[PDB]
C-alpha cells in the first residue's frame, strides 16, 4: 500500500525501489547510443541493479527519455507512460527532452515535463554515459527521500504521484 505508514518500512521499500530501478527502454534519438554505451563493456549501467532491461512498460519503473520527443510520438508515449505500474519514475535524458535543445521549432516538445512528470533532468549533447549514471544516482537518492533543491526543499520520492492524471 504505497510504501508508507511505518518509519522503518518506508525506508526499506524506498531503499529497494532506489537500487532496484528497472529501466524501461524508450530510445528516441542520438541520445540513445550514449545511453546504451552506459551499458557497454567500458561503462555498464548493469551494477546498480539495471543489468536486465524489460522493454515492456508493464514491468519496468524508470522511463529514460533518451532523445528528442517528437510530437507524433508524444501521445503514444503518453499511453506508454500510463502503461507503467504506478511505482514508476521518469527521467528526461538529453537536452532535446529536458529542454527544446537546439531544435526550437514546430516539430518538438520544448520540454517533456509537458506530457510526462519528469523526475530528473540531465543536460548534455550527448550526456556522457557516466552522466547518465550520475542522473540515476540523483534519482536514487531522490526516491530514497534524500534529495533537496536549491531552495532547500525535499523532493517527493516518486514524481508522477502529484498529477490528477485522469
Amino acid at each position: 500500500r504505497e510504501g508508507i505508514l511505518f518509519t522503518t518500512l518506508e525506508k526499506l521499500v524506498a531503499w529497494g525501489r532506489s537500487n532496484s530501478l528497472w529501466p524501461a527502454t524508450f530510445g528516441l534519438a542520438c541520445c540513445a547510443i550514449e545511453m546504451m554505451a552506459s551499458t557497454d563493456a567500458r561503462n555498464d549501467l548493469a551494477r546498480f541493479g539495471s543489468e536486465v532491461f524489460r522493454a515492456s512498460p508493464r514491468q519496468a519503473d524508470v522511463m529514460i527519455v533518451a532523445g528528442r520527443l517528437s510530437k507524433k510520438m508524444a501521445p503514444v508515449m503518453r499511453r506508454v507512460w500510463e502503461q507503467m505500474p504506478d511505482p514508476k519514475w521518469v527521467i528526461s535524458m538529453g537536452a532535446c527532452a529536458s529542454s527544446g535543445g537546439m531544435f526550437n521549432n514546430y516539430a518538438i516538445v520544448q520540454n517533456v515535463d509537458s506530457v510526462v512528470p519528469v523526475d530528473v533532468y540531465v543536460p548534455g549533447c550527448p550526456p556522457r554515459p557516466e552522466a547518465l549514471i550520475y542522473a540515476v544516482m540523483q534519482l536514487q537518492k531522490k526516491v530514497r527521500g534524500q534529495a533537496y533543491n536549491e531552495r532547500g526543499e525535499r523532493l517527493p520520492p516518486v514524481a508522477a504521484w502529484k498529477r490528477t492524471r485522469g
Partner: protein
C-alpha cells in the same frame, strides 16, 4: 554565435577604482541554460579574451528546470564543482569529490583546478 541561444549577457561599465574586467566593459549578468546548451565550442572560439571556455565536468544532473540555469558565480574558475555537487557538500558536510581525471588541463584553462596526471 550561440546556435542554441542559451547565453544572455547584461553588460555594465567597469568601475575604474575597483575594475572587474580588463577593458571598459564587463558582464554584469552571465547566465547559461545547460538544458539549452548543446556543447558546440563556438562560444570559446569567438571569445576574444578567452573568458568563456568549456570545462570538463559532466556530473550536472539536477531535478528542477529553473535550477539548471547556471549563473556566473556558479561557473567562475574560483569554484570547485557543479551545482548539485556543491549543494550536496553543503547538505552533507562532505567536501566536493570530482568524478573525473585528465592527463592535464589545457593552457586556455589557466587556473582550472583538476586532477593532473597524478602529481598530487
Amino acid at each position: 554565435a550561440c546556435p542554441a541561444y542559451a547565453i544572455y549577457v547584461e553588460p555594465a561599465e567597469n568601475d575604474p577604482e575597483n575594475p572587474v574586467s580588463a577593458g571598459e566593459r564587463y558582464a554584469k549578468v552571465y547566465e547559461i541554460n545547460m538544458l539549452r546548451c548543446i556543447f558546440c565550442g563556438l562560444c570559446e572560439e569567438a571569445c576574444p579574451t578567452g573568458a568563456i571556455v568549456l570545462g570538463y565536468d559532466f556530473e550536472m544532473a539536477d531535478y528542477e528546470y529553473s535550477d539548471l540555469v547556471y549563473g556566473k558565480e556558479d561557473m567562475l574558475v574560483d569554484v570547485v564543482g557543479t551545482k548539485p555537487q556543491r549543494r550536496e557538500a553543503k547538505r552533507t558536510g562532505k567536501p566536493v569529490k570530482v568524478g573525473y581525471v585528465v592527463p592535464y588541463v589545457r593552457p586556455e584553462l589557466e587556473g582550472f583546478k583538476a586532477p593532473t596526471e597524478g602529481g598530487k
